[PDB]
């Protein structure tokens, strides 16, 4: 139902980080994971003594939960961090597998971590060299429009959209690097069909 | 030194497997983490007077590669959804500089790793599924040394570096058999030492 595939989703963008060292705050922590997309939220453990050590983030959407899951199961400051998916998905595991099966039938990439300059073209241009792109949009404050990081591209072909993955994932773009994988969830994930 | 590439390559190799589940043993673990290499052996966390296992283990593979996929991949479920939590070893420190040194010399080739490799695939079989993505200039199987069977996994050079990109992405999780080949960039020069 729209209201199912509502609370997968919901619960599809969020991260479990853990370990968290002793001194760190709210803002570390968003800091490290911001990368992979805006953060929309964060919800850290609270003890009498600091936090129990570990968090939850929340990001706008799926696909930037799964790119800060496969990357940052590692150090802040060589091994401290782990990071997973949140321990309620039971009762949610199908509509997400079924998300992540729609998910399949798309060409679809995400791209954060898009300098502020870069426009849609420019976006299209770099990234229509692995195909032909049928869209490429950057995704934008509603107020101001100014594109907030991160956006989503179709290709024509999944070769295309399997080469774009492998080859701009962490491409130095600006003094940042790209975060590309590829979609999690279908583009309108559900109208009537 | 010979020495200290050695003792870099040996940690890792290791992956910290934590959040097991109480009824979980070494069995369970070991199943689940083979896929990406032949486990070496395991060491569980054990509590002397609860008379049970303290929630976490160390499995150690034959190579860095495999502990270097096996956390790529297994930070997931043994039973549920999310139980277990996959990481490198916390003693790394020490060793980071070398590793990191390792880590550099390994992109000067263009090498791959892949493991969960049917049994009765050979070499050539190996070398001719993958040499369609490129000029390979050499893939090998590891091998029993006194049997002579190989071990399941192994390591393929290409040419090109865009050829062994293009494997990498292509091939892992490829089903060749009833098993999916678990295909990951070297992260080791073909040999640390000499």
Redesign the interface.
């Known amino acids: 139902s729209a209201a199912q595939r509502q609370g997968a989703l919901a619960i599809m963008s969020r991260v479990?980080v853990?370990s968290i060292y002793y001194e760190l705050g709210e803002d570390t922590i968003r800091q490290a994971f911001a990368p992979f997309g805006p953060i929309k939220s964060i919800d850290m453990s609270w003890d009498v003594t600091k936090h129990k050590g570990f968090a939850f983030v929340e990001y706008e959407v799926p696909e930037a939960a799964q790119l800060a899951?496969?990357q940052m199961?590692?150090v802040m400051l060589?091994?401290n961090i782990?990071?997973?998916?949140?321990?309620n998905?039971?009762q949610a595991?199908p509509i997400i597998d079924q998300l992540a099966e729609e998910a399949r039938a798309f060409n679809r990439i995400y791209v954060a971590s898009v300098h502020q300059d870069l426009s849609d073209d420019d976006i299209k241009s770099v990234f229509e060299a692995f195909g032909k792109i049928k869209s490429a949009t950057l995704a934008r404050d509603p107020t101001t429009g100014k594109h907030k990081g991160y956006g989503f591209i179709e290709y024509e072909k999944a070769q295309s959209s399997?080469?774009a993955?492998?080859?701009m994932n962490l491409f130095d773009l600006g003094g940042q690097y790209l975060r590309v994988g590829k979609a999690v969830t279908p583009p309108m994930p559900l109208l009537t069909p």
């Open positions: 479990y853990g899951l496969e199961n590692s060589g091994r782990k990071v997973g998916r949140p321990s998905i039971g595991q399997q080469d993955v492998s080859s």
